[PDB]
Amino acid sequence: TSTVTGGYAQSDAQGQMNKMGGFNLKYRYEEDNSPLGVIGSFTYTEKSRTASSGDYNKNQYYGITAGPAYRINDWASIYGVVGVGYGKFQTTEYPTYKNDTSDYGFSYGAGLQFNPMENVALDFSYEQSRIRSVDVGTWIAGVGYRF
Numbered sequence: 126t127s128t129v130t131g132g133y134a135q136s137d138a139q140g141q142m143n144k145m146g147g148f149n150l151k152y153r154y155e156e157d158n159s160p161l162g163v164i165g166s167f168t169y170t171e172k173s174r175t176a177s178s179g180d181y182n183k184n185q186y187y188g189i190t191a192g193p194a195y196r197i198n199d200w201a202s203i204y205g206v207v208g209v210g211y212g213k214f215q216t217t218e219y220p221t222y223k224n225d226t227s228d229y230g231f232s233y234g235a236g237l238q239f240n241p242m243e244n245v246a247l248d249f250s251y252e253q254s255r256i257r258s259v260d261v262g263t264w265i266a267g268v269g270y271r272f
Contacts, residue, residue, distance in 0.1 A: 128153035128202075130238070130248065132267015134168055139260045145170040147186060149265045153194060153204075162194025164204055168265070187211040190232055190252070199243065202269070205235035210254045230256030238269045246270065 131150040138144055147170025155162045170186040192205030212228035215221065236250020246269030253262050 126155070126272040128155075128162075128164075128269060128271045130164075130246070130267060130269040131166070132265060134170060134263050134265040136170070136261040136263030140258055141172075141261070143172050145172055145186060145261070145263075147171065149267070151190075155194065155196065160196045162196065162202075162204065163191065164194055164206075165189075165191045166206065166265070168263075170263070184212055184214045184216075187213075188232060188254070192235065200238075200240055200246075202238040202246070202248070203235065204250075206232065206250065206252050206265075208232055210256060212256060212259065228256050228259070230254050230259065232263075234264070236265070240269075244270060 131148065133146055134149055135144055135146045147168050149166050149168045151164045151166030153162055153164040168188045172183055188210040189208035190206035192207055194202060194204040196202060209229050209231050232252050232254040234250055234252025236248050238246045238248030240246045248269055249266045251264040
């Protein structure tokens with residue numbers, strides 16, 4: 126039927142200052158005929174901020190990821206993630222006198238879910254992304270539910 130899974134993702138930032146953290150939500154679909162599973166997850170991560178900081182956000186991290194999924198026993202699932210990332214820097218409502226500015230890269234990884242509960246699931250996964258000059262190691266982990 127369908128499975129819900131999401132949590133938070135922290136990663137190291139080579140070329141960037143301070144690590145980042147975002148939220149990941151993903152939807153899953155499978156057919157009883159075979160163990161075929163496809164999932165689509167979105168991630169949004171930003172640099173940590175302090176209370177003294179204003180309400181402005183420096184850059185944002187948007188990304189797309191999805192991959193196949195296989196069912197193993199009632200407490201073990203495996204999946205992979207593939208897609209890209211978007212880096213928005215110096216974003217302003219006014220024109221920047223530039224044709225366009227965008228920094229992106231590709232991501233890849235996979236993880237597994239485990240839990241001694243029929244309706245509760247916890248999973249860990251790791252994925253790396255490279256954007257020509259930026260390389261960070263991000264991992265996504267949280268909960269999982271199956272209708």
